[model samples]
Target: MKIYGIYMDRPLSQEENERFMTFISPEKREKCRRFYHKEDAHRTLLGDVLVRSVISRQYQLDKSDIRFSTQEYGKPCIPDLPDAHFNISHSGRWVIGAFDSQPIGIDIEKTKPISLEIAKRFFSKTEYSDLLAKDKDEQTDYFYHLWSMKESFIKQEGKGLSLPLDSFSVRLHQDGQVSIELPDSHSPCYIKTYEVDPGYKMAVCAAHPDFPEDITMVSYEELLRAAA
Candidate 1:
């Protein structure tokens, strides 16, 4: 079995951000340059840096030597290292990355108030009802757990927005375990979630059951040094 790891980090400093920007592919930088908010641009750059640091060590390749190609659905991958599957997500001030030999997807969202109408419109029938089952104080938190897991599954499949959020259901057990009921054509997968940071909810889905309960915290400086 291949070991899987989750890495999370806060935003980058101006100097570190500039250094990391130099490593981003020209194509990604073009998109990064379009971010209206500077924080958004830094989050994008930090996500790339986290991927480079984690995969570089796994393959024992220099960070600059790493290259990526996206799938038909826009999921990024290492063409030369097909076994090294990974995904990236960012929200608020943090960026998270998940890596495993098997395909994996991850998502992190900063907790905030959400409208029930969103759950009614986008969430599956079972999921929306589950959200309503929560006590008013817990509804927002439960909604993000369900939302992040749904995103992770679609991302694990590399389907992106091509898949509808309402197509499948995620059932949360009383014991805090999650079981997903996907479309008939798809295989069942494993999911794990965590409070990655204050007020942030994170979830990871993988083709296999092996996943760490805790995220490995990688420092911005550590990533910078790894790239250097």
Candidate 2:
């Protein structure tokens, strides 16, 4: 199966400029740009356009043919093309996208020093205790890993955090087919998580069984130039 990923950068160019206008609707293109006043809309459009253009080129389809529709819970997906699935996540200036034959949910977080009490509030009881049992540095990393995993799981579940964070669990292992356990109180689901490096943060993407476990991260430059 073909799996694609994109990492958007801090700047944009003329080529990226042209592609942005062509990739999304005028209205949506504007919203993504204006959502944050601090960053130029042009940069936002360029990042989105750069990745989308590459996707179109790979599928040999016109950029206009590519469309997006969101779920009832607000998960954005391609409406007609169920066979092709993708997810996008951004934090700071980095935006990343993951595409595959099966459903995928990707997330990126800029790791910062966070308090232990804040971490305990969201983590599962098991993980919370384990985290308290660890040293300061280890606890910090564990908190971010748990944060990324939970974000990806909610995205994967299509609930957008409506499901309680304590409702599921993701085994924190650096190398393994990390496990998932959900409660009988809610629907049963399984997900896998992998470590991703987004330059400055701890990141992870969760996928269904049909998607490959091998996580491939690409450079910002590679995704910008890919034929789409």
Candidate 3:
């Protein structure tokens, strides 16, 4: 399994972004153009490219052989590569992907001031109570921690909001380990958190318990050049 990330702080014009779009399938190309902000569009396009690039490197599959599709719940899938799986997410200036032989999901959020009401409104009862139990100074970071974990699970489930954030709970133990609990299923889903960059929270969920020790960092320039 590998976690791949690309920092995208550089600016791109319409023509440059359009050039990059040629590297992806038309279905995804349209999704990129729909974003009103160029920054957001770039993030989405680069995220797609990052996963495709990694897929090519790991699977020895040529770019032309890749076929992108989505699950019933909107999880991105590579139809041609049915034996492997990947997920992508972005926040702030970072776009990241998680690739594994088994199904996997990843999420990253730029830690910032979030309303406690969000905890009350969206999180499960136990998660909100757990947040209330934290030291005031640690509460904000703790909120991001729980939020990121829950999102990772959602992405893993591939059901998005339809899966219900409150349907599951996250536990952060004193031993610096994390676990997730839902009503049933008892799937072997595991959650791993990372501090790849300061002020950002990332969580990855996978069918297997093992995860890479670190993320492989890439640059926007590399992704731009890879498409050509």
Candidate 4:
């Protein structure tokens, strides 16, 4: 399993953004072009380009040969690559893509002020308590830790919002392991949290239970050159 992180330093110009759009499917291109914020549109296109480009290189196929479908709950996947699973996430200046032989989900969040009340409202009772247990200065970071892990797990399940946030809980163990707890299961899933970029928190969840120690960074120029 590996995570590829790309840094999109600035918003793209029209032609550069359009170049990435060429890598997207027609239906998805329409959806990307429709975003009210141009940056949002660019980010969407960049994510698609990054995932498809990576997958193409891995399978030794042309980028255009790649095709994606979604689950009933809208998790995007490649139909021809059923043995491989991937998930994409973007935040601030970074876009991340994770690929694995088993089901996987990845999330990246730019750290900023977030209300603890939101945690109290959305997080499980135990999760809320865990946040409070942290030092006042540490709560914000811990909050994102919980948020990213929770999001990754649901994304791994490909159920998205259909799965209640409060129904599952994530624990950051003192021994440097993560434990995910659900209603009927206590088995650990592989979860790794990384401070991949300044002010960003990233977490990846895999169906297996082995935590990865590092994530590989991909150059923005590298993606741009390949997409071009």
> Which one wins on lDDT?
3
Q: Which digits, one per residue and each the tens of the lDDT, describe model 3 over residues 41-154?
A: 888988888887878766776554577887888888888788779999999888999998888889999888878676997788999999889998888889999988988987
Choose 1 or 4, whichever is better by TM-score: 4
What does the lDDT read for residue 18 in candidate 2? Answer: 57
Compose the digit string of candidate 1's lDDT tens values, residues 1-228: 222232334456667767888877887788788999988887788788778778888878877778999888789999999998889988877788888888888888888997877688769798998888899889888998888898888788887666554557787998979976665436567888877566878888887787775677767667778533
**With candidate 3 superimposed using the best TM-score fit, by how many Å does residue 30's alpha carbon deviate from the native?**
2.3
lDDT of each: 0.78, 0.60, 0.82, 0.80
Instruction: Rate residue 7 of model 1 by lDDT.
Output: 38
The sequence of per-residue lDDT tens digits that candidate 2 reaches over residues 76-97 is 7767667666666666565656
How many collisions between residues are there in candidate 1? 0
- Per-model TM against the reference: 0.81, 0.67, 0.82, 0.82
**Candidate 1, superposed: residue stretches over 4 Å from native:** 1-11, 116-118, 161-186, 226-228
Tell me which residue pairs clash in candidate 2.
53-228, 54-228, 57-228
Which regions in candidate 2 have their CA more than 4 angstroms from the true location?
1-3, 7-10, 14-19, 37-47, 115-121, 163-228
Model 4 per-residue lDDT tens digits across residues 1-228 = 878877877777778877777777999899997889877787778788888888888888767779999988888889999976899998878888889888899999887887867697779899999988999888888898899998888788776666554557787899869976673364346677888776888899887767567777776566666532
Choose 2 or 3, whichever is better by lDDT. 3
Rank order by lDDT, top first? 3, 4, 1, 2
Clashing pairs in 3: none
